[PDB]
């Protein structure tokens, strides 16, 4: 059973959260899912209140860490330096991902220096000025992290952890609970492809620097 | 502007409930959103609390009724005399809309005699039970009133709410805002699809029923 951290913060959208724990509650025996924040409780954008389950240091213990998103609450966590100090995140032991804004948290990290990601739409301009070089993809993989950019992007995101972690059953009984009825062909010709473009992409990305070092 | 009831009730999936307020609010020009429950507070499945804006009673005043859905929170409404009471529907004053189990509602208000509609794949099988001719499709419309199958059918839902309220541009700016980062056209191609296929069946019902009554 693999350990999964949902890192949060006041103003994070309901929408992303929500979907995110969700997809992930969609299978029982793959892993446990803890909420991990700076304080007993935060406030979604809408004041919807959700009890951490631990502190985001706790992220050091996780097999996967998540960055959820937020309009304010994403520029409000990255002025937050006991926040962003206790992301120690390692990509060599760890699984790292995020949705819409959360990349912007990663990006400042240092996480993906040199490196590819995405964000949502909205926000890429933003993103762009803090020197992310964002793509217009819905998922980008860059080892073992990846972002994901607006928020049904999520069926990306957790079916690539299905897919590192176990294999494309468990994506599909995972991703078969939220697709509209009667698709379920369409939306797994959808997806397979989305995360296998992403991962063709990520390993061109990988040959050029084996390439380089050479 | 039109006024939109959402009806909720104890034990409310969140997910399908956080994915319609979401949709409905990325136009601010369009209509108005109120939560409509039983109690000054309803909490979710997961536990969220969410305050109610007026009483299901409340329903009557809306130019568009949606019923959310709930794994255990559905099965409970039924059998609540003065919920099912407060819920006098008008298709021919009002879009009425389902999500989910949300549709168990409006087959057992009697507003789907003889008609079709479709409810959650895991659902089918009881709604069948219950008498209701359920297909194996995603948004299936009978003149007024739309059920929507799988979560993430919210997308047909709310989009035919703009189609027969507004136009195809509200439709696209709605939808634009959740879906996947650079995959705006496959997703306008699959959301106009699916809508124009479900008004398609729908026309083809109503020209029999007319043929018949003739």
Chains 1, 2 share one sequence.
């Not at 103003?11 to 992303?16: A, E, I, P």
Request: net charge negative; glycine share 8%.
């Amino acid at each position: 059973m693999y350990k999964v951290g949902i890192v949060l913060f006041d103003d994070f959208t309901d929408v992303d959260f929500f979907l995110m724990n969700d997809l992930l509650g969609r299978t029982s025996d793959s892993w446990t899912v803890r909420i991990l924040g700076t304080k007993p409780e935060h406030h979604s954008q809408l004041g919807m209140t959700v009890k951490t389950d631990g502190h985001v240091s706790e992220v050091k213990e996780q097999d996967v860490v998540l960055i959820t998103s937020g309009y304010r609450g994403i520029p409000a966590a990255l002025q937050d330096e006991n926040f962003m100090s206790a992301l120690k995140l390692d990509p060599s032991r760890q699984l790292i991902g995020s949705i819409c804004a959360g990349s912007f948290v990663l990006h400042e990290l240092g996480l993906l220096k040199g490196k590819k990601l995405t964000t949502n739409p909205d926000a890429k301009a933003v993103l762009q000025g803090m020197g992310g070089d964002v793509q217009d993809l819905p998922l980008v993989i860059e080892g073992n992290i990846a972002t994901a950019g607006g928020c049904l992007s999520l069926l990306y995101l957790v079916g690539w952890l299905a897919e590192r972690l176990f294999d494309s059953v468990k994506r599909k009984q995972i991703q078969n609970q939220l697709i509209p009825a009667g698709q379920m062909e369409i939306f797994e010709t959808l997806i397979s492809e989305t995360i296998q473009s992403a991962e063709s992409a990520y390993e061109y990305r990988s040959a050029c620097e084996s390439d380089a070092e050479s």
